[PDB]
DNA sequence: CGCAAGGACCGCATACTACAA
C-alpha cells in the first residue's frame, strides 16, 4: 500500500509525455521543441534558480511574472510551436509542484495547492531548495521518457 | 552461569565493513547479515577477537588498571604460577601463549586450549539506530518497533542475571505500533507543511504519540551514560524517527553505502586486469549494541586481585569506556573506527 | 519595471544594489542569481541583455559598472595569482604569456537565462581559459597540419578506415557512399578516428615528421604527448588567467553586438603553462604546438570571424 | 590498536577537483563522491592512499627520497636487508612486479606479495572542513557547519587517545554552537553594511551576536597548519569565516558546485560529435579538506635500521609531503585536481 | 536449486539465440557481450525503473506506448540497437513469464509489462523484481561472456 | 538554430583446519 515517489514520478511523467504524442502527433516540430526544452531546463535551474526559470518560462509566454495561475493556462492557446511547447512544459512542472501525482497518491505536491511561483516568492530558503530538488528529479524523468518516446 | 552482564554500545565514527563469507552475487564484498530477517549484524566472533587483541596489547604495556594498580604480566605470572612461571614467560616471549590476565578473562591461546574456558561471552551486535537521509532537516536516526521488541527481550534476559526489575518495567512502559506508513517523528524532521515527513524516497504521515519517543531517549540515558557518545542527548532527541517494520527493513537493504574501487597500473595510467570491483559499507553514525556476559572464572589458581565476577566486570568496565576500536577489514583506508560506551 | 523573481527581501536588496547604490563584489553572483528582469512598456518582462542595458543609463555606464565590480577583487585575484604561479613553478612547467589579437569569447553557448554567457570564474569573476580548450585546440591544430601536408599517405595507408568513414558520412548525410569527396575534411575525420579507438594501427604511419613551427614532431611523439585511450598523456594543459596588472587600469570586459554579449577586449594579457608529467621532454614541443595553434587558429567561439587569435 | 602516532593532513584545492563516483543517469552525468546519509561531499581514504603510495614510489624510484638527510637507494638499501634474496627482489622490482623496499615497508606489500605482511599507515577519510561560498559583500567566505565541528571534535578525541595527550581534547572542549535556521556567526568582513545582515548566495539572514567561537576555530588552524592557511595570512581567514546551520549548509553543497558542459567536436562537421555533450561536476577551488593518518610499528621482517620506530616513519612522511603539490581525482591532464598538502600534529 | 537451474537454462538459451543471429558478425556478438556485462552496474546505481527507461530510450524508434512484447530486435537498424533490443526482450520476458506456466519460475510480473508493472504496483513488488533481475543478469553475464564472440 | 557520452575493466592471488578428547 506504500509507493515511493519514484513510482509516482514515472507515472506522472508517462502521463504527460503520452498526453503530448496523441494530442500533437502531426506537429513533429512541437515534439522536437518540447524535447529540447526538457533537455535544456535543468541546466538553467542549476545555474540561476527555480524562480528564475519559472519567470523565464512566463516571459517566453508573454505573461506577467508577478501574478500567475498555472491552473488557468490552457496550452492550446499559444500559436507558435515554441510558445505551445513552453506552455506545456510550464504547466507540467507547476502541476507537479502543486498537486504531485494526485491527492489520492502517496505524493500530493509540495505547495499544497498553491502557485509554485508565489510559493517561492513567499517562503524561506529551505522550502525553495526542496522544491528545486523535486523539480530537478521530475525534469530528469520527463526528459528520459520524452527522449525515449517522442 | 553468567552471573553478571555488561551492555556494550558501539558508535561508528567511520564507515565499517565487516567482511562476509564467500564473495558471491552482484555485490563483491557484502556486509554480514542474517538470512533470518535481513538486517545488518556483527557476529560475536569478530568482536571477541578484536577485544582480545586490544586487551592483550594493552596488558603487554602494563597499562591495564587492575584495581588502580597497573598489574604487571611478568610479576603476577611469577607470583601465581611460581616455579613453572618462568617457562611460561618464555612462551610469552615467543608469542605462543598470552599473559595471565587476558588468558584468564578471554580464555587461553590455541596451543593451550585444554585447561579452562573463556570467562566471558560476547553476543552478536544488533542494530538499534540507522541514519537515513531526510528532506527537511538532515540525517535522521531511524528505528522500528521490532528493534524495541528485541531490546525488551535483551533486558528480560539481563533480568535473569541481575534481577533488574526496574529496567524490565521501564522497557515494558514502551509499547507502540505504527501500522503501514505512519511514523513517530521528532520536531526537526517534520516538514513545514502539514505533517508529511519525507524519508529518502518515501512520504509518510506523522503520528501524535511522541511521548513514547521521549521514553526511548530516557532508556538511552539509562543505558549508555549521559551524553550520547559525546553529544548532547537532548540534541539527538529531536531527530529520532520510528517507522513500520517493512519500511525499516527496506531501509536496511537499499541505503548502505556502495563503493567502486579500482587498481591503477604501474605505468599504463589506467586500470589493470582484475582491477575493478565493488564493496558495501555500513554508514557512519550507526548505533549498534551487544550483550557481554561474565560467569565464574574457571582458571586454575586465579590471582587474588581478579577472583570474582564483580572484579572482572569492573576491570572490563574501566578498560573499555569511551575508548576507540578498529573493527573489520579495510583498516588502512580508515574504515572500522568506533567508539565504545559501556 | 525591474521586478525580480526572488523572495521579497532579497528582491528589494538586489533592487537597491542594482542602481549603483551598494558594492557587491562578486560579479558572477550579481549576474547569475539576482537577474534584473525588465518589463519595458508594451512588452512582457523580458530578460535579454538588451533590456539590462536599457536599465542602465548608457552602454558605457553598464560597461563601467561591470569593470568596477570586476576590479573590486584585485587583492584576492593577486593572492590567487601568486599561489597559481607557485604551483606552476613547483611542477617544473614551461610558462609563457601572449595577448589577444582581437576580441575573445569562450563558452558562448553555456546555457543561462540571458541568451549568452561567458566562463567567468566562480570565486572572483575574472574571465579565464580552461585547459580543456587548450588541449582540444592543440589536438585539432595538430590534426589539421598533419592532414594538410601528408594527406595522401594517411588516406592511402588506412584504406579500410577511409571506406568506413565514407560509409558513415553517406549514411548520416543520406547520400551515396561514392558521393563523399576525399577532401581535407574527410582526411581530418579519418585522422580523428585513427586517434580514436582504432589507434593500434597508427603505428604503421608512425614515421612522418610534421614540421610544427621550426621543429619536426613525429606522430609517435603526438601519441606520447596528447595521450590515448590506453595510455595517459604526459603533458598537462593548465588554465589561463589574465595578469592582474593589466586589469589594474585597462578594462577587462566589453560589450559587442540589438543582440549584445560580453567579450574580452583586444590586447588583454594571458599567461599559459604546460607541464611534463613523466620524464619525457615533450614539454617544449607541446609548448611550440600550442603557441602555433594560438597564433593561427586561436581558441574561442566564433573563431571564423577573427575571434580568439593570439599574437606574440 | 597498533597505532601510536598520528598526523592531521590538510588539503587546500587551488584548481577545481573531481573525485569520480561512476556515472549516473541524472542531470549531472559525472557526479562526485558523497556520503549517502548526510549528502555532503567527501573524498574516501582509498583514493588518498593510492595517490600517496604512487607519489612515494615515484620519488623513491628516482632516489629523491631523503630519509635522515640521505637518499634511500632502492637497490643499495634493499641489498643489506633482503641479503641473499636481494637479487631476486631487485629484478622483480625492475620488472614492475613488486614495489620498492621503502614503499613496501611503509604502505604495505604490493599486489603480488599481498599475503606477506601488513602496512603501517591508516590514512582515513577526508571530511569537509571549509566550503568556499560566494558572498555579496566581501568575497569568497569559508562556510562551515556545527556538524563539521562535532566531527572535528571527535577526530581530535581520537588523536588525543592515540597520542595519550589530553591537550587536543582541552583545546576542542570549548566548541559549543547552537545556531538557528536563519542566523550565522559571521565574521566582520562578510557583514553587509546595513542591519547586521549577510547575503550568501540566495539567502539573506540575520547575524547572531557572539564571540570567543570563531577565534577558537582559527586557533585550531594555528595549531596544526603552521600560521598560514595554505600560504595566505591567517588574519584574513579569521575575518572571513562564517558559520551556518546544517540545513542551509547542506543546501549550499548541493547547488554551489562547478558545473561544466564539456563536449567533443568532430572534425568532419566541425560542430559536435554524435553524443558528445555532457555535464561534469567539480568541487570549487579554495576548499579546505582534512583527513587523519595513523602510523603504527613496521611489520616487515628484518627491516632496515633507519625505519624501525613509528617516530622515524612519521618524520619521513612529514618531511616528504609537507607543503607539496599533489594530484587528486580525474582529468589530471586537462588541468583539474591539484591541491596543496600540509601536515602537523 | 530448481530456480537456479531454470535461470541457467534460460541464460544459456538466450545467449545461444543471440549466437544464432549474426553468428559470423562479431560486431553484434561483441556489442551484446559488453551490454550484458555493463548492465548490472546501472541497476545498482539507479534502480530497475531507471534502467528500463534507459533501455527504452537507447532504442532508435518512435516506440509508441510500452510493450515488452513486439519490438523485434532484428527490425532494429544499427547493431547496437539490435543488441539492446535483444537485452530488453530477454530481461522483460524473464521478469514477465520466466520460462512458462509449467516452469519453476513463472515470472513475478504475471505476464505483465515490467515497466507498467513498476508504474502501477507497491514497493515490495519493485524490490523483488529488482532482486530477480539482478540474479538473472549475474548468470547471463557469465554465460554470454563464455561462448559469444 | 540547433546539438543531447561511449567505450575500455567487470575481483584478482593466498589462506583453504589444528590440537586434544
Swiss-Prot record, chain A:
GO biological process per UniProt: defense response to virus
Alphabetical list of InterPro entries matching this protein: AF1862-like_dom_sf, CRISPR-assoc_prot_Cmr5
Chief location: cytoplasm
Localization per record: Cytoplasm
Keyword vocabulary terms for this entry: Antiviral defense, Cytoplasm
Domain of life where this protein originates: Archaea
Stated role: CRISPR (clustered regularly interspaced short palindromic repeat), is an adaptive immune system that provides protection against mobile genetic elements (viruses, transposable elements and conjugative plasmids). CRISPR clusters contain sequences complementary to antecedent mobile elements and target invading nucleic acids. CRISPR clusters are transcribed and processed into CRISPR RNA (crRNA). Part of the Cmr ribonucleoprotein complex.
UniProt family annotation: Belongs to the CRISPR system Cmr5 family.
Name of the protein in its database record: CRISPR system Cmr subunit Cmr5
Annotated organism of origin: Archaeoglobus fulgidus (strain ATCC 49558 / DSM 4304 / JCM 9628 / NBRC 100126 / VC-16)
Designated gene of the protein: cmr5
Swiss-Prot record, chain E:
Family annotation (CDD domains): Cmr5_III-B
Keywords linked to the UniProt accession: Antiviral defense, Cytoplasm
Cytoplasm as UniProt keyword: yes
Main location: cytoplasm
Subcellular localization(s) per the UniProt record: Cytoplasm
Source species, domain of life: Archaea
Gene Ontology BP terms: defense response to virus
Gene3D superfamilies: AF1862-like domain
Matching InterPro entries: AF1862-like_dom_sf (IPR023101), CRISPR-assoc_prot_Cmr5 (IPR010160)
UniProt KW Cytoplasm keyword: yes
Annotated Gene Ontology cellular component terms: cytoplasm
Family to which this protein belongs: Belongs to the CRISPR system Cmr5 family.
Function: CRISPR (clustered regularly interspaced short palindromic repeat), is an adaptive immune system that provides protection against mobile genetic elements (viruses, transposable elements and conjugative plasmids). CRISPR clusters contain sequences complementary to antecedent mobile elements and target invading nucleic acids. CRISPR clusters are transcribed and processed into CRISPR RNA (crRNA). Part of the Cmr ribonucleoprotein complex.
The name this protein goes by in its record: CRISPR system Cmr subunit Cmr5
Source species: Archaeoglobus fulgidus (strain ATCC 49558 / DSM 4304 / JCM 9628 / NBRC 100126 / VC-16)
Designated gene of the protein: cmr5
Amino acid at each position: 500500500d506504500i509507493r515511493e515517489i519514484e513510482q509516482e514520478r514515472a507515472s506522472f511523467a508517462f502521463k504527460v509525455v503520452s498526453d503530448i504524442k496523441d494530442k500533437y502527433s502531426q506537429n513533429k516540430k512541437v515534439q522536437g521543441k518540447y524535447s529540447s526544452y526538457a533537455e535544456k531546463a535543468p541546466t538553467i535551474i542549476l545555474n540561476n534558480g527555480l524562480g528564475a526559470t519559472l519567470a523565464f518560462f512566463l516571459s517566453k509566454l508573454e505573461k506577467p511574472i508577478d501574478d500567475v495561475d498555472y491552473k488557468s493556462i490552457n496550452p492550446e492557446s499559444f500559436g507558435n510551436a515554441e510558445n505551445i511547447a513552453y506552455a506545456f512544459l510550464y504547466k507540467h512542472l507547476s502541476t507537479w509542484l502543486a498537486e504531485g501525482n494526485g491527492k489520492d497518491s502517496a505524493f500530493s505536491g509540495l505547495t499544497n495547492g498553491e502557485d509554485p511561483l508565489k510559493y517561492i516568492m513567499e517562503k524561506t530558503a529551505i522550502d525553495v531548495a526542496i522544491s528545486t530538488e523535486e523539480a530537478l528529479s521530475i525534469l530528469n524523468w520527463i526528459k528520459k521518457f520524452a527522449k525515449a518516446m517522442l | 552461569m553468567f552471573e553478571k552482564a555488561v551492555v556494550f554500545g558501539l558508535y561508528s565514527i567511520t564507515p565499517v565493513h565487516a567482511g562476509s563469507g564467500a564473495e558471491l552475487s552482484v555485490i563483491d564484498l557484502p556486509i554480514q547479515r542474517e538470512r533470518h530477517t535481513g538486517f545488518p549484524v556483527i557476529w560475536g566472533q569478530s568482536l571477541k577477537g578484536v577485544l582480545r587483541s586490544r586487551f592483550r596489547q594493552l596488558e603487554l604495556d602494563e597499562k591495564i588498571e587492575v584495581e588502580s594498580q597497573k598489574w604487571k604480566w611478568k610479576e603476577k605470572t611469577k607470583e601465581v604460577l611460581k616455579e613453572k612461571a618462568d617457562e611460561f614467560i618464555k612462551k610469552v616471549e615467543e608469542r605462543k601463549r598470552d599473559p595471565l590476565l587476558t588468558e584468564i578473562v578471554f580464555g587461553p591461546a590455541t596451543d593451550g586450549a585444554s585447561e579452562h574456558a573463556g570467562a566471558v561471552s560476547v553476543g552478536d551486535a544488533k542494530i538499534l539506530l540507522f541514519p537515513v537521509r531526510s528532506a527537511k532537516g538532515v540525517f535522521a536516526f531511524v528505528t522500528s518497533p521490532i528493534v524495541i521488541q528485541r531490546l525488551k527481550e535483551d533486558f528480560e534476559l539481563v533480568s535473569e542475571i541481575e534481577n533488574d526489575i526496574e529496567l524490565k518495567q521501564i522497557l515494558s512502559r514502551f509499547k507502540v505500533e505504527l501500522s503501514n506508513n505512519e511514523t513517530i517523528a521528532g520536531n526537526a524532521l517534520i516538514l513545514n507543511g502539514e505533517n508529511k515527513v519525507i524519508l529518502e524516497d518515501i512520504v509518510l504521515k506523522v503520528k501524535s504519540d511522541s511521548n513514547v519517543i521521549e521514553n526511548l531517549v530516557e532508556v538511552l540515558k539509562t543505558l549508555f551514560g549521559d551524553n550520547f557518545f559525546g553529544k548532547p542527548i537532548e540534541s539527538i532527541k529531536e531527530r529520532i524517527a520510528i517507522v513500520s517494520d517493512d519500511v525499516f527493513k527496506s531501509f536496511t537493504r537499499f541505503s548502505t553505502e556502495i563503493v567502486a574501487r579500482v587498481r591503477i597500473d604501474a605505468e599504463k595510467g589506467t586500470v589493470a586486469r582484475g582491477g575493478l570491483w565493488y564493496e558495501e559499507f555500513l554508514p557512519s553514525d550507526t548505533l549498534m549494541y551487544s550483550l557481554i556476559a561474565v560467569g565464574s572464572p574457571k582458571k586454575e589458581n586465579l590471582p587474588k586481585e581478579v577472583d570474582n565476577t564483580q572484579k572482572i566486570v569492573n576491570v572490563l568496565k574501566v578498560t573499555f569506556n569511551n575508548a576507540f576500536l578498529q573493527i573489520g577489514g579495510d583498516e588502512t583506508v580508515g574504515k572500522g573506527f568506533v567508539k565504545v560506551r559501556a | 519595471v525591474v521586478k525580480y523573481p526572488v523572495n521579497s527581501e532579497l528582491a528589494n536588496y538586489a533592487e537597491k544594489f542594482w542602481k549603483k547604490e551598494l558594492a557587491i563584489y562578486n560579479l558572477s553572483l550579481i549576474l547569475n542569481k539576482m537577474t534584473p528582469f525588465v518589463k519595458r512598456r508594451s512588452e512582457s518582462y523580458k530578460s535579454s541583455l538588451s533590456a539590462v542595458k536599457e536599465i542602465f543609463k548608457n552602454v558605457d555606464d553598464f560597461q563601467n559598472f561591470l569593470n568596477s565590480v570586476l576590479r573590486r577583487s584585485l587583492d584576492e585575484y593577486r593572492v590567487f595569482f601568486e599561489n597559481y604561479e607557485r604551483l606552476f613553478n613547483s611542477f617544473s612547467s614551461k610558462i609563457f604569456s601572449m595577448r589577444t589579437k582581437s576580441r575573445l569569447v569562450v563558452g558562448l553557448g553555456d546555457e543561462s537565462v540571458y541568451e549568452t554567457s561567458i566562463r567567468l570564474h566562480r570565486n572572483y569573476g575574472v574571465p579565464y581559459i580552461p585547459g580543456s580548450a587548450l588541449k582540444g585546440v592543440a589536438k585539432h591544430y595538430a590534426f589539421s597540419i598533419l592532414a594538410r601536408e601528408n594527406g595522401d599517405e594517411i588516406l592511402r595507408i588506412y584504406e579500410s578506415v577511409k571506406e568506413d568513414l565514407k560509409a558513415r558520412i553517406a549514411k548520416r548525410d543520406k547520400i551515396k557512399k561514392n558521393d563523399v569527396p576525399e577532401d581535407y575534411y574527410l582526411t581530418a575525420a579519418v585522422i580523428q578516428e585513427l586517434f580514436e579507438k582504432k589507434f593500434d594501427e597508427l603505428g604503421a604511419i608512425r614515421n612522418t615528421r610534421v614540421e610544427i613551427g621550426d621543429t619536426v614532431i613525429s606522430v609517435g611523439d603526438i601519441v606520447k604527448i596528447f595521450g590515448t585511450q590506453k595510455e595517459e598523456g604526459s603533458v598537462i594543459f593548465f588554465d589561463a588567467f589574465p595578469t592582474p596588472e593589466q586589469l589594474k587600469d585597462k578594462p577587462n570586459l566589453e560589450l559587442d553586438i540589438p543582440i549584445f554579449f560580453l567579450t574580452v577586449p583586444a590586447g588583454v594579457e594571458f599567461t599559459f603553462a604546460v607541464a611534463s608529467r613523466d620524464l619525457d621532454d615533450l614539454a617544449e614541443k607541446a609548448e611550440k604546438l600550442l603557441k602555433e595553434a594560438l597564433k593561427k587558429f586561436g581558441v574561442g567561439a566564433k573563431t571564423s570571424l577573427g575571434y580568439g587569435r593570439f599574437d606574440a
